Coordinates of C-alpha atoms and ligand atoms in Angstrom, one line a residue:
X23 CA 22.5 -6.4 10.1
X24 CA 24.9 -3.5 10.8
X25 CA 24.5 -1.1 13.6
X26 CA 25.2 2.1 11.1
X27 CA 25.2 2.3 7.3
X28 CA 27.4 4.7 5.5
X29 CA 28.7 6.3 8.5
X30 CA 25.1 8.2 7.7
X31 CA 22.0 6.3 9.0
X32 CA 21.9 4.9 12.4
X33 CA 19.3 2.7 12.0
X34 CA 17.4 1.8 15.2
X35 CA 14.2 -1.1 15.4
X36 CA 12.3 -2.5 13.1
X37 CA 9.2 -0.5 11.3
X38 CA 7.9 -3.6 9.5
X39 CA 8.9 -5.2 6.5
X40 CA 8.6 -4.1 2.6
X41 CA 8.2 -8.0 1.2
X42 CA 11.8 -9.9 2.3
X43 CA 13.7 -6.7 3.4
X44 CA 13.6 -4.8 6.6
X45 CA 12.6 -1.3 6.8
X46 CA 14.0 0.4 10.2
X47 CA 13.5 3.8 12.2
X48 CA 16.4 5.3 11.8
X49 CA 18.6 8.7 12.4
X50 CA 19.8 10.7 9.8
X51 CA 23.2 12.4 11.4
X52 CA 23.7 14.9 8.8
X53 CA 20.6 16.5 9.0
X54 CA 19.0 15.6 12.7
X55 CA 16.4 14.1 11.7
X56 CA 14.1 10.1 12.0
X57 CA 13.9 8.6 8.7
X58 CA 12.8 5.2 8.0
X59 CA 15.0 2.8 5.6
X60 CA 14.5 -0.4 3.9
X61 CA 17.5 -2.8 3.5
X62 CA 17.6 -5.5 1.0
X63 CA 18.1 -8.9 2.9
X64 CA 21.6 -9.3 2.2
X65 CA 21.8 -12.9 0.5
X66 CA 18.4 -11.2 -1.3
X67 CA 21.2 -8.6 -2.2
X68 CA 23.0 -11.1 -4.1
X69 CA 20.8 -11.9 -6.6
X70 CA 19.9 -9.5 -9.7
X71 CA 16.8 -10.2 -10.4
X72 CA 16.2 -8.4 -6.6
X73 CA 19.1 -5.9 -6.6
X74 CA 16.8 -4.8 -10.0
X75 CA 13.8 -4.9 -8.6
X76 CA 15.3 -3.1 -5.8
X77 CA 16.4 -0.2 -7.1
X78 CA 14.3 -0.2 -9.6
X79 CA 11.7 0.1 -6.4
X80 CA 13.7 3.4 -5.1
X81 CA 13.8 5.0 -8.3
X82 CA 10.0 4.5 -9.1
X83 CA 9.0 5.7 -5.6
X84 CA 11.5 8.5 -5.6
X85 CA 10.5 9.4 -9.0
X86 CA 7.3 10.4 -7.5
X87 CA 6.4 13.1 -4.9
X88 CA 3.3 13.7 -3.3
X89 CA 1.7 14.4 0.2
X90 CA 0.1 11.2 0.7
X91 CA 2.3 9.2 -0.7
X92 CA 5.6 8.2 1.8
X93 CA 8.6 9.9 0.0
X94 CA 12.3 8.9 -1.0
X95 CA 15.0 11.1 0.2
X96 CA 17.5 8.4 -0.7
X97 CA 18.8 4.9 -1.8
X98 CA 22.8 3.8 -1.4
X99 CA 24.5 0.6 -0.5
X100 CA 26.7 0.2 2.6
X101 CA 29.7 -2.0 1.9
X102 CA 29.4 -4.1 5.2
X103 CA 31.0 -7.0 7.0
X104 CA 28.3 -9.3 5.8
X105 CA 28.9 -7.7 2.1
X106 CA 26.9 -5.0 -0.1
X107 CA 23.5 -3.9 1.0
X108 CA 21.5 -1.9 -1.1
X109 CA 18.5 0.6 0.6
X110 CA 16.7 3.3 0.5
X111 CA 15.7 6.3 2.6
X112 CA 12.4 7.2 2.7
X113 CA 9.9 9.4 4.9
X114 CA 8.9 8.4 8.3
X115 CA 5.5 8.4 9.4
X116 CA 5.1 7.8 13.0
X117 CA 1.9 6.2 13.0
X118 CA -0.1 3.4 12.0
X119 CA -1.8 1.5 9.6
X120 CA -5.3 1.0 8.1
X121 CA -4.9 -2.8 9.2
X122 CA -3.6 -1.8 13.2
X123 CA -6.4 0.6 13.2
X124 CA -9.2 -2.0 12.1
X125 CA -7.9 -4.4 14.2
X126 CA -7.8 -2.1 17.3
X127 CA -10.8 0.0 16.6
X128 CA -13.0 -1.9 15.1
X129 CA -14.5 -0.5 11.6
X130 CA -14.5 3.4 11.7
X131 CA -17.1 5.4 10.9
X132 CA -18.5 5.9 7.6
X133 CA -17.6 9.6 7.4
X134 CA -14.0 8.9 8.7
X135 CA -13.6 6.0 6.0
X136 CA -14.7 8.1 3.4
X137 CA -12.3 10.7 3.9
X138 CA -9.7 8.5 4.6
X139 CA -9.9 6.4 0.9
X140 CA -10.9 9.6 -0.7
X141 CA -7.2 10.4 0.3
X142 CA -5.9 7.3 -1.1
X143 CA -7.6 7.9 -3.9
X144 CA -5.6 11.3 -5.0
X145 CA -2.0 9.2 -3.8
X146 CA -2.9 6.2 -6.0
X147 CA -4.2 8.8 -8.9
X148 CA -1.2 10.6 -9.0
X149 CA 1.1 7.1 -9.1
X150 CA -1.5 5.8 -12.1
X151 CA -1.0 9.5 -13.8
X152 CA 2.8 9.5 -13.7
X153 CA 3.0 5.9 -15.1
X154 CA 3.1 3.7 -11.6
X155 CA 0.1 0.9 -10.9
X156 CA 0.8 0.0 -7.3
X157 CA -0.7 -3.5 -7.4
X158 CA -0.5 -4.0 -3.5
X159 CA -2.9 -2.0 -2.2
X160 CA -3.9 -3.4 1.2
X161 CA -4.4 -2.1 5.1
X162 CA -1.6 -2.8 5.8
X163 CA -0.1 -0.3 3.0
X164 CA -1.5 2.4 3.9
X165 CA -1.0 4.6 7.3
X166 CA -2.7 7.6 9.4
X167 CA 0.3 9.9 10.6
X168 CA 0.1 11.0 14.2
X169 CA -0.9 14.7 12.7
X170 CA -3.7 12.3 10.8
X171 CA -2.8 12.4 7.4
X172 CA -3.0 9.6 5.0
X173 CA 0.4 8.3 3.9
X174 CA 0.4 5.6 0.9
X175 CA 3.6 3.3 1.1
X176 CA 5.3 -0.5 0.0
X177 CA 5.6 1.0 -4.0
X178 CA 7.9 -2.8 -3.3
X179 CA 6.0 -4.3 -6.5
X180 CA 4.4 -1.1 -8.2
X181 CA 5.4 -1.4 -12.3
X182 CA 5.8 1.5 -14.2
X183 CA 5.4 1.4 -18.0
X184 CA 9.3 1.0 -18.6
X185 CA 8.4 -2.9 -18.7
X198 CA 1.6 -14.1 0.5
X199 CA -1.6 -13.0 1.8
X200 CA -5.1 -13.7 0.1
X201 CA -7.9 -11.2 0.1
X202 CA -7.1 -8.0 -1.3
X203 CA -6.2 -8.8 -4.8
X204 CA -7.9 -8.2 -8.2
X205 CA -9.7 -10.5 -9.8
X206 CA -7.3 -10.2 -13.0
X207 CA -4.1 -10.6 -10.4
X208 CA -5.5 -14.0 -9.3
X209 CA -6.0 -15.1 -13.3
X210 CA -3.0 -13.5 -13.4
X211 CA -2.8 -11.6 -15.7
X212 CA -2.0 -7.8 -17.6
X213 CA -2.4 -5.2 -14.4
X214 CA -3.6 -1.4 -14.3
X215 CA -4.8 1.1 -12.9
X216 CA -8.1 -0.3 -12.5
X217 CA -6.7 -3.3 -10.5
X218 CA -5.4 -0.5 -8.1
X219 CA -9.0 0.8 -7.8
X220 CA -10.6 -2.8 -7.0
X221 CA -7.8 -4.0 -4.3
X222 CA -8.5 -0.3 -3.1
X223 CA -12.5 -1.1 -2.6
X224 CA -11.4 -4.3 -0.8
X225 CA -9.9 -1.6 1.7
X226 CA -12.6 0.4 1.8
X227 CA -15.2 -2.6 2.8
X228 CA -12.8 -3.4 5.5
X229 CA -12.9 -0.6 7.2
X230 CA -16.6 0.2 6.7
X231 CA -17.3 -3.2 7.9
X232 CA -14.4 -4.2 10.0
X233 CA -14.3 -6.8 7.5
X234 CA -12.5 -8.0 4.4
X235 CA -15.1 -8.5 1.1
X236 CA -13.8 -12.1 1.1
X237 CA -11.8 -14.8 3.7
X238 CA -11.0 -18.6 3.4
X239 CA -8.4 -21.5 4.4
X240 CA -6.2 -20.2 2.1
X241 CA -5.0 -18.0 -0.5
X242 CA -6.5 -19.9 -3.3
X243 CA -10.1 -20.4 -1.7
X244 CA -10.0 -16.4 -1.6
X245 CA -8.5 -16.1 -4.8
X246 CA -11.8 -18.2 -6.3
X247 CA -13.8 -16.0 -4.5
X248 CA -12.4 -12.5 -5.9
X249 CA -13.3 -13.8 -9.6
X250 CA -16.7 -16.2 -8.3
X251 CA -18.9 -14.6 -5.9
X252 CA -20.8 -11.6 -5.8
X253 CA -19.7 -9.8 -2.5
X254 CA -22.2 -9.2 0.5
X255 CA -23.1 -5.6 0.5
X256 CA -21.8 -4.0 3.2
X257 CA -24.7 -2.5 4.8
X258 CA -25.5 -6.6 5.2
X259 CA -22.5 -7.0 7.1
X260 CA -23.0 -3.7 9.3
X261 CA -26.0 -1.7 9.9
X262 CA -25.4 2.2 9.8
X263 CA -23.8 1.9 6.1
X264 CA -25.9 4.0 3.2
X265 CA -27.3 2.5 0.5
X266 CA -26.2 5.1 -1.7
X267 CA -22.4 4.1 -0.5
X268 CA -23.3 0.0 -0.7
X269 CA -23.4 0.9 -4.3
X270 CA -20.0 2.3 -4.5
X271 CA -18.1 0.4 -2.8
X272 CA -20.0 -2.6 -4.9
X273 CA -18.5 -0.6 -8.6
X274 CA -15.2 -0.7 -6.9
X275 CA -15.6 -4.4 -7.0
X276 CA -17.2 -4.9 -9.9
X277 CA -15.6 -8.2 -11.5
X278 CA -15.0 -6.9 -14.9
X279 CA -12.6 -4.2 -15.1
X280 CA -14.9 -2.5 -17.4
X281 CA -18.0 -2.1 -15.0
X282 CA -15.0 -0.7 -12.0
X283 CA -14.4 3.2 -12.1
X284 CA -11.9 3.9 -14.7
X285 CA -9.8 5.6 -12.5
X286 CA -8.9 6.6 -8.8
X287 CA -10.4 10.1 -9.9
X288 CA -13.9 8.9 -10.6
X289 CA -14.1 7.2 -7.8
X290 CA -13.0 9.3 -5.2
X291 CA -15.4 11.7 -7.3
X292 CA -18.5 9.2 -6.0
X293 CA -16.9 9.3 -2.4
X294 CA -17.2 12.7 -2.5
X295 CA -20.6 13.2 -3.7
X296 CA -22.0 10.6 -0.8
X297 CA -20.0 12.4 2.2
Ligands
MIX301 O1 6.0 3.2 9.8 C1 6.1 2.4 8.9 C2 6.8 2.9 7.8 C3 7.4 4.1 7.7 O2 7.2 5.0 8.8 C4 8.1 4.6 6.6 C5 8.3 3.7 5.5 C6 7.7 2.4 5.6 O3 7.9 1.6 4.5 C7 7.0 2.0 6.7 C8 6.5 0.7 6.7 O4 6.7 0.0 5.7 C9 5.8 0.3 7.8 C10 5.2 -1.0 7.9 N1 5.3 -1.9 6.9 C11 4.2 -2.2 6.0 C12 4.6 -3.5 5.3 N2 3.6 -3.7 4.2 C13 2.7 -4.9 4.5 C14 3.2 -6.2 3.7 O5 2.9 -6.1 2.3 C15 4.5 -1.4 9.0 C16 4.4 -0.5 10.1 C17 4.9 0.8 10.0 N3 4.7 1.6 11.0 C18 3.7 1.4 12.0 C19 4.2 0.7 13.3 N4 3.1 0.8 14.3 C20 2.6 -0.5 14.7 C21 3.4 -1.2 15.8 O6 4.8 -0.8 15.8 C22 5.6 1.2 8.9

């Protein structure tokens, strides 16, 4: 890919990548300042179905605004060498993410988890109350900025109302079927037992042995994976998870709510 877009961004190396596209720390000449910028593969960028999706993705994302949730300052498409290419410039967050942080740390501590979800919570609240489910919600997605605040990002397959991986889906994502915001608040428990117990809820050889497991077994409580972890806390994290969207918190609200009332 191209060196500078637009004449605008200079984009520099490679933040990590939003499904097939690349998102890049880059410069914003105008107005001095690091922004990061996603950049629809290019052949990708050919085909409607993703150029839809893709700006579709801006437009939803943009059309929110929130502290813990990454913003959009902008989406264009530079008319390269190697043809159109469609992106979008968001916030940066020089940081790192739930998944670097388990991996490097280990789990965190219960008070720090707490805290750190409860955030997520309000993000992914806000999304569900202005019409966006997420659906991706995953380590990975979500980040601690250097000044430690909690940045919610990758809104690369959230669905408004206008209408890979394994462990973290919902139960009615692996039948495949109808999302909401409850499916949101599950994948977000999943989270949350990761980093209580430095490990996922569920794991097997494949997606599909994990997928059987998010809608068959019950999960371990935490506090039999990891000592130190309330029993008052097993129990929410356990709702979260509950198989039947009906027996999960009803919203991100409710839940963070309970989160609230254990720290
Ligand atoms: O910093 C972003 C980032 C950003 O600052 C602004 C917007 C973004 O979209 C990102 C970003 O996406 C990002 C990373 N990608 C996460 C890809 N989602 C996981 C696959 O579903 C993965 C990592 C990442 N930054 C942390 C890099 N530190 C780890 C080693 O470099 C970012």
């Amino acid at each position: 890919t191209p060196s500078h877009l637009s004449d605008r961004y200079e984009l520099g190396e490679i933040l990590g990548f939003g499904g097939m596209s690349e998102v890049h720390l880059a410069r914003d000449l105008r107005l001095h300042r690091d922004v990061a910028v996603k950049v629809l593969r290019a052949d990708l960028a050919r085909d409607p179905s993703f150029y839809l999706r893709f700006r579709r993705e801006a437009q939803n994302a943009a059309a929110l605004n929130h502290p813990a949730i990454v913003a959009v300052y902008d989406t264009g498409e530079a008319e390269t060498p190697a043809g159109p290419l469609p992106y979008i410039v968001m916030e940066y967050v020089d940081g790192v993410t739930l998944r670097d942080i388990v991996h490097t740390e280990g789990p965190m501590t219960p008070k720090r988890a707490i805290e750190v979800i409860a955030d997520a919570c309000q993000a992914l609240n806000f999304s569900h109350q202005n019409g966006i489910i997420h659906r991706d919600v995953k380590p990975a997605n979500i980040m601690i900025s250097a000044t430690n605040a909690v940045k919610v990002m990758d809104f690369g397959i959230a669905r408004a109302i206008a209408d890979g991986t394994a462990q973290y889906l919902s139960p009615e994502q692996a039948r495949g079927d109808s999302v909401d915001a409850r499916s949101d608040v599950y994948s977000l428990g999943c989270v949350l037992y990761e980093v209580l117990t430095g490990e996922p809820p569920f794991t097997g050889d494949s997606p599909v042995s994990v997928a059987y497991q998010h809608v068959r077994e019950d999960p371990i409580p935490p506090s039999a994976r990891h000592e130190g972890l309330s029993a008052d806390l097993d129990a929410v994290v356990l709702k979260a998870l509950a198989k039947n969207p009906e027996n999960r918190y009803q919203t991100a609200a409710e839940m963070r709510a309970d989160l609230v009332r254990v720290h």
